[PDB]
C-alpha cells in the first residue's frame, strides 16, 4: 500500500560504507504457486550535496 521510502544518508553513514539490507515479512496468498517472481525498486537520487 505505502510504496515510497525516503532514506537519507549523512556524513557519518557515507564515510563508513553504506549497506542497505532487506528484511521482508511475507504471507503468500492462499494456494498460489509461482516461480522466479520479479521485485523491482526504483532508486531516485533526489538531492545530493
Amino acid at each position: 500500500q505505502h510504496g515510497k521510502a525516503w532514506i537519507t544518508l549523512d556524513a557519518e553513514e557515507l564515510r563508513e560504507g553504506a549497506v542497505l539490507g532487506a528484511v521482508m515479512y511475507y504471507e503468500v496468498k492462499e494456494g498460489v504457486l509461482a516461480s522466479r517472481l520479479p521485485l523491482v525498486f526504483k532508486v531516485r537520487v533526489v538531492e545530493t550535496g
Partner: protein, 49 residues
C-alpha cells in the same frame, strides 16, 4: 647691418613605453587533482595565486 630674427629654441622628449599593469593569469582547473566533483555536489574551491 643685419636685423636678427630673435628666436632661439629648446626641446625635449617624453617616452611612454609600457602599459601600467601586467595581469599574469595562472588559470584554475577546479576539480583539481586527488579530488572529485560530482553531480549535484556542493562545496568550495580555493586557488591562492
Amino acid at each position: 647691418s643685419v636685423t636678427s630674427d630673435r628666436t632661439y629654441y629648446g626641446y625635449g622628449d617624453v617616452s611612454v613605453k609600457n602599459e601600467p599593469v601586467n595581469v599574469v593569469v595562472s588559470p584554475f582547473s577546479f576539480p583539481g587533482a586527488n579530488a572529485s566533483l560530482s553531480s549535484g555536489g556542493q562545496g568550495v574551491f580555493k586557488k591562492p595565486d
